Amino acid sequence: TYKYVNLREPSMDMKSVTDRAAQTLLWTELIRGLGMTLSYLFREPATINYPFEKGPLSPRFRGEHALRRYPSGEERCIACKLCEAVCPAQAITIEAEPRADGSRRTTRYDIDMTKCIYCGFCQEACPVDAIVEGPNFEFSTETHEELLYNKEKLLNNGDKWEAEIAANIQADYLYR
């Protein structure tokens, strides 16, 4: 249940001593290393052609956040504040009131994406699949406050990415 790395006493007969002296004087392991580097010279490189090729992702991927809707246009978030209760960065800020038809909806739904640790606890805490974390990772900004998302940005991300978000949830909801 254990093995000894580097507990080999070398053979001291003239054959092995001449082997090690030929290794010293004729640089045999150095030519071995040159041969291994030369072997990688003639391989096809592992380089993908970004942006025209994309790295492989799964339907579980945790990228940009989005607020979703039912298949009626009604937004799924019913202001229950589980996602900011579980948010380990406290990146989520929610206010709420009954809207004009008496429905429990949010007035504020902020996610500071620069506090956010992208761990998907909000999408697993959400009882109505409202907040999800979409597949978008190509959303670098040029200013810090463009990453301080309010509810309108998250609803636009939901409307923007729903055709993909719904298919990824369709692929992964039986594991959840």
**Between residue 60 and residue 119, which ones bind ligand SF4 under the rule CB under 6 A?**
77-83, 86-89, 91-92, 94, 111, 116-119
- Considering beta carbons, is residue 24 or 156 the nearer one to ligand SF4? 156
Question: If binding is defined by CB under 6 A, does position 155 make contact with ligand SF4?
Answer: no
Distance CA 77, CA 128 (A): 7
Query: Which of ligand SF4, another protein, none does residue 22 bind to, with CB < 5 to 8 Å depending on kind?
Result: none
Number of residues that bind another protein (CB under 8 A): 111
Query: Exposure string (b/e) for 24-46, b if CB count within 10 Å is 16 or more?
Result: eeeeeeeeeeeeeeeeeeeeeee
Indicate whether 173 belongs to the interface with another protein (CB under 8 A). Answer: yes
Does 120 bind ligand SF4 (CB under 6 A)? Our answer is yes
Nearer to ligand SF4, 118 or 137 (CB): 118
Cβ neighbourhood burial of 3 (10 Å; 0-12, 13-18, 19+): exposed
Contact status: 22 vs ligand SF4 (CB under 6 A): no
Q: In angstroms, how far is the first alpha carbon of the chain from the final one?
A: 40
Tell me, residue by residue from 127 to 146, as one string, x for binding to ligand SF4 by CB under 6 A and - for no binding.
Answer: -x-xx-x-------------
Q: Is the separation of the CB atoms in 122 and 67 below 8 Å? A: no
Instruction: Write down the residue that tokens 């956040």 correspond to.
Output: 65
- Count of C-beta atoms within a 10 Å radius of residue 98: 10
Residue 1 interacts with which of ligand SF4, another protein, none, CB < 5 to 8 Å by class: another protein
Q: Looking up tokens 């909801």, which residue turns up? A: 173
**Beta strand pairing call for 131-133 and 65-67:** antiparallel
Beta carbon of residue 113, minimum distance to ligand SF4 (angstroms, whole number): 8
21 binding partner (options another protein, ligand SF4, none; Cβ < 5 to 8 Å by kind): none
Window 107-146: contact mask with another protein (x via CB under 8 A)? xx-x-x----xxxxx--xx-xxx---x-xx-xx-----x-
